[PDB]
Design a protein around this nucleic acid. Structure first.
Lengths: 46, 184
RNA sequence: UAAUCUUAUACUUAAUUCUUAAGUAAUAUAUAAUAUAUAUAUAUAUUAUAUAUUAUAAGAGA
RNA sequence: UGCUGACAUGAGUAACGAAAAAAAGGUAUAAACCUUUUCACCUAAAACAUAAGGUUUAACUAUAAAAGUACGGCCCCUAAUUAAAUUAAAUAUAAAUAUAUUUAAGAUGGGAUAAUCUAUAUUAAUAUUUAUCUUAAAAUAUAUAAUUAUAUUAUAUAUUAUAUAUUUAUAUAAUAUAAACUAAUAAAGAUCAGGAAAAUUAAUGUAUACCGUAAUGUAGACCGACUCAGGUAUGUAAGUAGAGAAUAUGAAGGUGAAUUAGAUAAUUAAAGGGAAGGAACUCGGCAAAGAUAGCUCAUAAGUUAGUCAAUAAAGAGUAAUAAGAACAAAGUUGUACAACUGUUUACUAAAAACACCGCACUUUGCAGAAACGAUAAGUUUAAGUAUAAGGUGUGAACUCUGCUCCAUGCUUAAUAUAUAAAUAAAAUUAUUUAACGAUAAUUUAAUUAAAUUUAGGUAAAUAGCAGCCUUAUUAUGAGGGUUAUAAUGUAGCGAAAUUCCUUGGCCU
RNA sequence: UAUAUUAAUAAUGUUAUGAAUAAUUAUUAAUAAUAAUAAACUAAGUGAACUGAAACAUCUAAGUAACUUAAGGAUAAGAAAUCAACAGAGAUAUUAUGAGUAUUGGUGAGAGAAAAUAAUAAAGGUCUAAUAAGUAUUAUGUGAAAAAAAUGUAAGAAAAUAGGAUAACAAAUUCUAAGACUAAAUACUAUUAAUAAGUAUAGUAAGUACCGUAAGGGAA
RNA sequence: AUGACCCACCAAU
RNA sequence: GGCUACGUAGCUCAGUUGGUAGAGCACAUCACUCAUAAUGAUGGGGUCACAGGUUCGAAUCCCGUCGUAGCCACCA
């Protein structure tokens, strides 16, 4: 069993979990977004 | 036990039928394997099943393979009625509750022998890992070199004693039980 | 046991709708009291009176 | 082993990541690019379609053309599930929030019509798996009021002739192949009992949205830090062979690669062959070697009766007689341990560990035992109800499971039994006052808990299970004697994975 | 689907024995929606651990970090039931001094006021309440290391002839709880201005490249 | 002659 | 090997928290019996295994030898 390939992309899943709207919808995600904005981040979410 | 296809069963909860009213007089026919009646009509001693608890409530006792309860006594005034449940416990049940004459079916589920671990999974029973097999962090019986019981009293993964320890105790006990079930 | 407590399941004014009131009506709970009376009791029914417009049902119960 | 940067050394060293190349010409420039030709490798694929993913990697900027029928999305509807949503007072909660209900979301699934092409709109009403056997029937030989015979066996199509309608229409009979495989069908076996959710005609419409569309997808175009022998979903997948998608080949297709050219010392890897031996090797037959159909027969002991054993082993026929593809096929027996089929240390341990089926114990009556729950509501247990659920030990079955509650717990009953908080009281107290009074302390009557103690019970709870001496001429020790315990190791079994001495004595 | 709807009308327009039915278009009326908006400071709820104690449990760390909520330009406090002491002072706040002092502490580590005196500071006093009870108090479990006020449970007053304050008590003294408001001096941000024995590694790029599935990290 | 030995007792219908 | 308990009347077992010169059984001597054996009634033996030491007095005690199950068990 060879490791290394732990990332296994699937756009839909990514957008569900780490997408902007998911962040927006949760309180915790909204807080994250705010924190990133404060930092100065160009890209707040996937 | 013997309700095979093509038989007629009745329900007397809503008062004896206005049919048998027109025609002791018929109590013989009244108590027949499978017909429902408020215990207030059951002859004391009749093996029953689907025993209830409240006069306006569903059957909630002896409803399993081979289970059979018995109307032990019928306090006519209090409105309750001592009954012997499968465990052997004499509990008060509202004299006007639902109980059905008849030992439940599958009187041999007590002989079935799922003989392959597969059969258990189809049924829905994932494997039980023994406390003695575990590590100490996981279960009190765990740890030790070789196989050991750690001088630890037989108990659950959360420290509740497994052998003999009465779990329903003190103030929070059953109010309606007349005589407790036979033990050991 | 109306302490706790479980479970289950019309209309007239006034201020399309809604709320208040009054008037009656209606239901029901009884009361006032009679009816026809029977085994000092009473089936009731009654005009009339009280007075309503979370209940009820089941279980537990100071 | 300071940090950043630069640059050294190893060193022009190792390596250039499974491989088949040649030539001729593009192009008096080409190992490496294109073209042609030869050769080769992959072929139930290195092929052709695709899914997902992605620096567009493409046959590219003059670019991946869709009203719908073997187009998908979008859309309609739901599953698992999610949700600053939902419902004087939905319930619960340091806040956060959580729960329950509603409601809206959620494809991996469902979803109308259609090549003799097709019309979705508005309005009025009113299907777990698995099988396709038998038998019977129709048919060609027999033989020709037979028995055999072996094949046929539900479906789909054109043709011919009719027949009904008038050259469509449809019915009707007529001939018409082997193997697969497929779709609609029917009838049918088991236990493990097999999703959800979204009307009808009739009338009237319908000037057809958007979005994916390349190439890549067993990989140089995604994941693996690399153009990385790893990982990566699906249908196809010439023929000839065969039981088969096995194995050989390979028509067509697609490849021949960011190292070549020589050389082939020692030496290493990967192979082939090997005289006479024949496990002498060695920790140990590790590795390698070994196959006298693969079909059809035939197949023991034992045993839980299961061709389990067993694909038995050997042996046999079909083929073969010097031998003359690949591929499946690799002996037997004793012992320890585990019943089994399984599980486990992803990256050193696959077992003698785990699991298991069975067995027992034990809790819990259901407004329940268990578990979770800053802690609740509440949830799972279960739309289950003691033949259930939870816990616990042992781990199929045979033959069997002896003794003890000491300890420790559990359990039961005792007004045995200490004590904690909680009271009206009023009193000695003090201290203060001028006394009144006030503020403390302190006793003292009332109804004492659980607990412990103590007595049961409970060891398939947790646990535990003697010594000495002496004895039938010697030996042994039935017997005998003492003592001691809560009980005193019982039946098995025994130098065991348990044996120190110990390479125990004896046997093979 | 507000280039909508509901109309009403205007007109070409239809089924229809003008006439009631609609089809546009056109007017007019009337009917709706339109959250990106900071961070810091402040207040409140909850509330650590390391560490200190040369260990360590009390204690510290520390009501700090952290998480939650909410408010404003600030907020908080604020006009005495305060202190004091036989004299007296007169809201609150910040600073100095008092003072590391009284007090306090496994009397260890350690923690630590106030009065008073000055600074700063603004107009700094002023009705808003028909005067404050389940409150004063008390008992009890807690409770800013000193210094108390609060709070769960429950008992529970009194009218100025009163009530708070001091183990207690007696004197005396002071003040009015259970109703209120309050600039300014302050925190923070941003800006302008001025000064820099500050910065060219604190001198403009970049939260970019890039690493990570993600929060997050983070260049030159 | 044969011919060294013999051993058990407990309480009623 | 300093290092825990045990060395008894022939046999077994004593005794305990001192206030000490026990038990049966075996043996000898009677008896009982026809003769045994049981049963019965009569006597036997402790240096309570050796040193030394204490309260008034240790089987007991302290104080350790000649004696009884013994002691190996941080290995990479």
């Amino acid at each position: 069993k060879s490791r290394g390939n732990t990332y296994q992309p699937s756009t839909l899943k990514r957008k569900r979990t780490f997408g902007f709207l998911a962040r927006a919808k949760s309180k915790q995600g909204s807080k994250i977004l705010k924190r990133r904005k404060l930092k100065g981040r160009w890209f707040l979410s996937h | 036990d013997g309700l095979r296809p093509g038989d007629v069963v009745e329900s007397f909860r809503r008062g004896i039928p206005q049919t048998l009213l027109n025609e002791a007089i018929l109590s013989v026919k009244t108590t027949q394997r499978g017909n429902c009646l408020p215990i207030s009509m059951i002859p004391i001693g009749t093996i029953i099943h689907n025993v209830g608890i409240t006069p306006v409530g569903p059957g909630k006792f002896c409803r399993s393979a081979g289970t059979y309860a018995r109307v032990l006594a019928k306090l006519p005034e209090k409105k309750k009625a001592i009954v012997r449940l499968q465990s052997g416990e004499h509990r008060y049940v509202s004299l006007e509750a639902v109980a059905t004459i008849g030992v439940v079916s599958n009187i041999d589920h007590q002989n079935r022998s799922l003989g392959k671990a597969g059969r258990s999974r189809w049924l829905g029973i994932r494997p039980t890992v023994r406390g003695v097999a575990m590590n100490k962090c996981d279960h009190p019986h765990g740890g030790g070199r070789g196989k050991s019981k750690s001088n630890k009293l037989s108990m659950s993964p959360w420290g509740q004693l497994a052998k003999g320890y009465k779990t329903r105790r003190g103030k929070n006990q059953n109010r309606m039980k007349v005589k407790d079930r036979p033990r050991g």
